[PDB]
Amino acid sequence: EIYKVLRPGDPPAAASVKALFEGLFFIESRYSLSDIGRMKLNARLGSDKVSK
DNA sequence: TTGTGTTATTGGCGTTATTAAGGTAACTTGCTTAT
């Protein structure tokens, strides 16, 4: 369903969207917070139990 | 004023440098481009 939103009128596949999503937020060379987003989120939530 | 000397051009010629056309047979198979 997400893959429809991102690419409308694009017939989905089996082993394609599995790359799309996990590359949308979960690729170290595609998305980052660079020591600041991490700290400003941790302190905002307290959860040191996530690696800063 | 009429003779003998240029000339300026102007279609023909060739010459060739430049442009266009075509052909290889080891196997090769679906981005998305990012306030």
CB A32 within 8 A of CB A25: no
The one-letter amino acid code at A48 reads D
Number of alpha carbons in the 13 Å side-chain half-sphere of residue A5: 4
Q: Residue A12 is inside which H or E element, if any?
A: none
Encoded tokens for A35: 């020591």
Distance CA A18, CA A3 (A): 10
Give the CA diameter of chain A.
Answer: 42
Measured CA to C1', what is the nucleotide nearest A11? B30
Measured CA to C1', what is the nucleotide nearest A31? B34
Resolution in A: 3.5
Distance CA A2, CA A13 (A): 12
Number of alpha carbons in the 13 Å side-chain half-sphere of residue A22: 5
Q: Which nucleotides of B are covered by protein (CB under 7 A)?
A: 30, 32, 34
A32 touches strand B (CB under 7 A): no
Question: A42 Cβ partners below 8 Å, 6+ apart?
Answer: A48, A50, A52
Distance CA A1, CA A45 (A): 30
